[PDB]
Write a protein that binds this ligand. Sequence first.
Ligand SMILES: [Cl-]
Ligand SMILES: [Cl-]
Ligand code: NA
Length: 129
Amino acid sequence: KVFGRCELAAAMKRHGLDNYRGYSLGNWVCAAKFESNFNTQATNRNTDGSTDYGILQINSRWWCNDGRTPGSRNLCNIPCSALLSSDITASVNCAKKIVSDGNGMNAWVAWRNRCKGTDVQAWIRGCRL
Ligand SMILES: [Cl-]
Ligand SMILES: [Cl-]
Ligand code: NA
């Protein structure tokens, strides 16, 4: 599923990301924009052999199981496929763990490089929320 911007904002809101770990909703929407272009089915193969899955590009190196990431963990306790779902619940719940892992949203390289410090209000402009 390719979410609209405001559609995604509403869903992330509902599931409790606005202010999660102190990160305003716009942070999360901006991160998803540059991680997945709002596409739940997005995947990305990393140099180390791990893969990123879903609208927040959750990495198989720690967070989900894909059966092809040697030495990896599954701290979110779910098959990486469950992160490609049209429904974002598994991705959000797992994102909550990731952002709690010590470095906040810096865990998403694209957030650090493209969203951090920017006008992330703008990502939820016009959105009936
Ligand atoms: Cl915001
Ligand atoms: Cl933080
Ligand atoms: Na894994």
